[PDB]
Scaffold this active site. Sequence first.
Site, PDB file in Angstrom:
ATOM      1  N   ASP A  23      19.329  13.954  21.074  1.00  7.26           N
ATOM      2  CA  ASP A  23      18.865  12.673  20.500  1.00  7.26           C
ATOM      3  C   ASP A  23      19.951  11.601  20.516  1.00  7.26           C
ATOM      4  OD1 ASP A  23      16.840  11.030  19.440  1.00  7.26           O
ATOM      5  OD2 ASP A  23      16.434  12.363  17.760  1.00  7.26           O
ATOM      6  N   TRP A  65      15.124   7.467  24.118  1.00 12.05           N
ATOM      7  CA  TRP A  65      13.978   6.542  24.101  1.00 12.05           C
ATOM      8  C   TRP A  65      13.901   5.395  25.118  1.00 12.05           C
ATOM      9  CZ3 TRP A  65      16.698   7.399  19.262  1.00 12.05           C
ATOM     10  CH2 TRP A  65      17.753   6.463  19.019  1.00 12.05           C
ATOM     11  N   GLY A  66      14.383   5.616  26.349  1.00 10.09           N
ATOM     12  CA  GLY A  66      14.216   4.661  27.448  1.00 10.09           C
ATOM     13  C   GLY A  66      15.204   3.512  27.456  1.00 10.09           C
ATOM     14  N   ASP A 112       9.312   7.270  20.043  1.00 10.89           N
ATOM     15  CA  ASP A 112       8.491   8.408  19.595  1.00 10.89           C
ATOM     16  C   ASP A 112       6.993   8.200  19.666  1.00 10.89           C
ATOM     17  OD1 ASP A 112      10.953   9.540  19.068  1.00 10.89           O
ATOM     18  OD2 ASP A 112      10.790   9.533  16.897  1.00 10.89           O
TER      19      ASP A 112
END
Length: 363
Positions: free
Chosen positions: A130, A164-165, A185
């Site tokens: 993460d 997350w891109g 998410d």
Amino acid sequence: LSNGLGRTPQMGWSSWNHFACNIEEKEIRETADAMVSTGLASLGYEYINIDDCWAELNRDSQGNMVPKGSTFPSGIKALADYVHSKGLKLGIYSDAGSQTCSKQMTGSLGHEEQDAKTFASWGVDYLKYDNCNNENRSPRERYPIMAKALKNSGRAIFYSLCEWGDDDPATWASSVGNSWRTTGDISDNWDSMTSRADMNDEWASYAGPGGWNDPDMLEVGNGGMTTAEYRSHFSIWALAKAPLIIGCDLRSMDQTAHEILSNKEVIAVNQDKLGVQGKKVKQNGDLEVWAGPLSGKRVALVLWNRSSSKADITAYWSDIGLDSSTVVDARDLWAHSTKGSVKGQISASIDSHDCRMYVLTPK
């Protein structure tokens, strides 16, 4: 990443979507038991992924990540060993940061090699990494440090970037890891799921064996979407060669949820040798056509009705990469029936939020 893993998209389950931070080894073990019990393991689902909150805020005296003494008293080796003995593989989570996103356990920023070696010694098979609490450093900088830590550890560990891109991962992540989150998410509702699918579509041509675009964990079975919605959801993810990571509770799966996830003809599209990510090709308003090539000169294809009401959708053959004069047998993957000698187009009257998925085989 050529580490021998993810030659097709990963199939498994993660704790996060259904349990979030409320987690313990007992639930992890019973989950794996259900992955076998309910036949999911024999269809290809192998990864039992533990997401956030498995460890302590502090590290042990020697600088290592400590599994949470209250919820994982047997340790992580014990759990990997159990999962291996069931023919499965174990995943864990950490952060390219000082803590994880929940702020309930430490991260691996500045402890990457030590954490990769620990992981290896525990028999870990997969890592979700993460992107919280990253002290304002590039993902291009932090993510390779862990790719190379994994590479140099004892064992082959699947590497799932969860970032997350940010900084468009697809453009640089192929040589870094096995899959990359392209969006923020997913939540268990239609607008979320669909936006994830849309966002992910533009990165279609960057995904192959070794490195998949990741529109996030399946929400099939969580009860915030309809059967029709879930059918589409699984269907589109399958076609888009997404990881198929189940995100409901295996130990208490709804029968329709289970049925949806068990369609092996759809799984075979996702797991197709050719490894090309299918994509939106055509958009008649809320009526969409998504297509992509498969091995043996075939075509996978979804007719998707994102309308609020019932609608006819037509996939013309110019839209989906065939001569119009080509003839096929058209396998309807959900109805599990074939239709012979279809020529320039296929059509269907389809319910709201539902879809048709086919595999087209030339004569």
